[PDB]
Write an enzyme that holds these catalytic residues in place. Structure first.
Site, short mmCIF file in Angstrom:
data_model
loop_
_atom_site.label_atom_id
_atom_site.label_comp_id
_atom_site.label_asym_id
_atom_site.label_seq_id
_atom_site.Cartn_x
_atom_site.Cartn_y
_atom_site.Cartn_z
N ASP A 5 -1.83 17.12 14.52
CA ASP A 5 -2.55 16.86 13.28
C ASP A 5 -1.84 17.44 12.06
O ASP A 5 -1.97 18.63 11.76
CB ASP A 5 -3.94 17.50 13.40
CG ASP A 5 -4.88 17.16 12.26
OD1 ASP A 5 -4.42 16.60 11.24
OD2 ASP A 5 -6.10 17.44 12.35
N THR A 6 -1.14 16.58 11.31
CA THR A 6 -0.44 17.03 10.11
C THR A 6 -1.37 17.48 8.98
O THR A 6 -0.94 18.18 8.06
CB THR A 6 0.49 15.93 9.60
OG1 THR A 6 -0.26 14.78 9.23
CG2 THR A 6 1.50 15.50 10.63
N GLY A 7 -2.64 17.08 9.01
CA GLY A 7 -3.55 17.48 7.95
C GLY A 7 -4.24 18.80 8.23
O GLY A 7 -5.04 19.29 7.42
C1 LIG Z 1 -9.96 17.49 6.21
C2 LIG Z 1 -8.50 17.94 6.39
C3 LIG Z 1 -8.04 18.57 5.10
C4 LIG Z 1 -8.43 18.99 7.52
N1 LIG Z 1 -9.00 18.63 8.82
C5 LIG Z 1 -7.98 18.09 9.72
C6 LIG Z 1 -8.09 16.57 9.85
O1 LIG Z 1 -6.88 16.03 10.35
C7 LIG Z 1 -9.32 16.18 10.71
C8 LIG Z 1 -9.24 16.51 12.25
C9 LIG Z 1 -10.34 16.18 13.06
C10 LIG Z 1 -10.26 15.03 13.94
C11 LIG Z 1 -11.38 14.66 14.75
C12 LIG Z 1 -12.59 15.43 14.68
C13 LIG Z 1 -12.68 16.58 13.81
C14 LIG Z 1 -11.55 16.95 12.99
N2 LIG Z 1 -9.74 14.81 10.54
C15 LIG Z 1 -10.78 14.31 9.92
O2 LIG Z 1 -11.60 15.06 9.35
O3 LIG Z 1 -10.89 12.96 9.93
C16 LIG Z 1 -12.09 12.28 9.59
C17 LIG Z 1 -11.76 11.08 8.74
O4 LIG Z 1 -11.13 10.19 9.69
C18 LIG Z 1 -11.99 10.21 10.84
O5 LIG Z 1 -11.25 10.16 12.10
C19 LIG Z 1 -11.13 11.52 12.57
C20 LIG Z 1 -12.47 12.12 12.19
C21 LIG Z 1 -12.71 11.55 10.80
S1 LIG Z 1 -9.91 19.80 9.59
O6 LIG Z 1 -10.28 19.35 11.00
O7 LIG Z 1 -11.20 20.00 8.80
C22 LIG Z 1 -9.08 21.35 9.71
C23 LIG Z 1 -9.31 22.37 8.73
C24 LIG Z 1 -8.61 23.61 8.87
C25 LIG Z 1 -7.72 23.80 9.99
N3 LIG Z 1 -7.05 24.96 10.13
C26 LIG Z 1 -7.51 22.78 10.94
C27 LIG Z 1 -8.20 21.55 10.79
#
Ligand SMILES: CC(C)CN(C[C@@H](O)[C@H](Cc1ccccc1)NC(=O)O[C@H]1CO[C@H]2OCC[C@H]21)S(=O)(=O)c1ccc(N)cc1
Lengths: 99, 99
Positions: free
Chosen positions: B25-27
């Site tokens: 996960d690059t984000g």
């Molecule tokens: C919102 C971003 C700035 C950061 N997020 C990582 C991100 O890649 C997540 C990672 C992620 C992936 C699946 C479930 C929860 C979190 N994806 C996500 O929120 O995606 C949403 C929008 O697209 C949809 O498909 C995926 C879920 C929806 S995060 O999970 O909140 C996060 C925050 C801080 C850290 N240290 C690690 C991860």
């Protein structure tokens, strides 16, 4: 280009004539942008993230330039902490993860 | 390997002796793993994302094997819906985003 990950992979996107910053996010299935006006009719969608679900507005066939690359696809608009470019658009610009 | 993004980029990781599936996960700034036991002292922390914040336990100097690549760094343990490998460990294996 080839982006390393020592810093957040942020790029400039152009959407609705405005320049904004966005995160290249392999972990996001969908592209989500902070609140703004986009043209057309929207549909409802629920998106689940790390701390729960949020309701967003889904817009389709939106034109968006990502780091100089043109993409046309679905964009979700809602209360996200930061603009995120997800897999749906990353595939259009031909992005890949390599190691 | 060169990973396309048509589907979620899930890989097999080994941590604390257990085999698990995780998202590259690059984000994500940091790595977050589902509730499990790890040895060592830990600090509480709050991580925020889409939907709000969650409380996690921060473990330092933890060794993870990502797709057969050895890496060491901070690992967060908490009620995440999926195991995430963040930038803190992607850098160690030499992962880059290309387009
Ligand atoms: C919102 C971003 C700035 C950061 N997020 C990582 C991100 O890649 C997540 C990672 C992620 C992936 C699946 C479930 C929860 C979190 N994806 C996500 O929120 O995606 C949403 C929008 O697209 C949809 O498909 C995926 C879920 C929806 S995060 O999970 O909140 C996060 C925050 C801080 C850290 N240290 C690690 C991860």
């Amino acid at each position: 280009p080839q982006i390393t990950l020592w810093k957040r992979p942020l790029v400039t996107i152009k959407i609705g004539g405005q320049l904004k910053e966005a995160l290249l996010d392999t972990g996001a299935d969908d592209t989500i942008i902070e609140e703004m006006s986009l043209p057309g009719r929207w549909k409802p969608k629920m998106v689940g993230g790390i701390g729960g679900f949020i309701k967003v507005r889904q817009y389709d066939q939106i034109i968006i330039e990502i780091a100089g690359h043109k993409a046309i696809g679905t964009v979700l608009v809602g209360p996200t902490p930061i603009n995120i470019i997800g897999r749906n658009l990353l595939t259009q610009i031909g992005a890949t993860l390599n190691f």
